[PDB]
Amino acid sequence: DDVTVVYQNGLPVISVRLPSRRERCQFTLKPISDSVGVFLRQLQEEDRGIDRVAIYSPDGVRVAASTGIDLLLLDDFKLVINDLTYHVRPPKRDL
Ligand SMILES: [Mg+2]
Prior knowledge:
The chain is built from 2 helices and 6 strands, in the order E-E-E-H-E-H-E-E. The chain is α+β, with helices and mostly antiparallel strands and 95 residues long. It has one domain. The strands form 2 sheets. Strands 1-2-3 form a 3-stranded antiparallel β-sheet, covered by helices on one side. Strands 4-5-6 form a 3-stranded antiparallel β-sheet, covered by helices on one side. It binds magnesium ion. This is Calcium uniporter protein, mitochondrial. It comes from Homo sapiens. Belongs to the MCU (TC 1.A.77) family. Residues 3-93 are annotated as: N-terminal MCU domain. It is found in: Mitochondrion inner membrane.
């Protein structure tokens, strides 16, 4: 029902339900070279129904697109997809 972050084979896998279908979709990311912007672009490419997507800190401050996925996953964040906000809780990993 929500957005999960699970490490598989050493890499974070973010799983989400996208608005156009029920089938959940997963996004494996490279912490040290992918950015927030890359992930958001992948989401948009996956579902044309997505009009708006953005990531925010738990305090509701927008997270810069250039920020590395490793940094994003140091703490909780919010992922907004159209009119829904997901509270995402990554497992804490040093770095
Ligand atoms: Mg915190």
